Amino acid sequence: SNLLLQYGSFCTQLNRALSGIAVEQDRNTRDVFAQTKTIYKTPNIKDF
């Protein structure tokens, strides 16, 4: 670890990239599915 501290900020860059990917996945799911702010009740009958 003491020798690795001399290699700059590679681990920080890798962590930022992975965190960006992680947040983007949740953004993808929210954009695809979360389009309405109201949740209609399932009607009792399922024969229209």
Ligand X SMILES: *[C@@H]1O[C@H](CO)[C@@H](O)[C@H](O)[C@H]1NC(C)=O
2 binds its own copies (CB under 8 A): no
Kindly tell me which of 33 and 48 has the beta carbon lying closer to another protein.
33
- The rounded Cα 44 to chain-centroid distance in angstroms is 35
For residue 44, how many C-alpha atoms fall within 13 Å in the half-sphere facing its CB?
0
In the complex, residue closest to ligand X by CB: 47
Tokens 């930022």 belong to: 16
Q: Does 36 bind its own copies (CB under 8 A)?
A: yes
Residue whose pair of structure tokens reads 């399932």 in the numeric block: 42
Residues in contact with its own copies by CB under 8 A are 3-4, 6-10, 13-14, 17-18, 21-22, 24-26, 28-45, 48
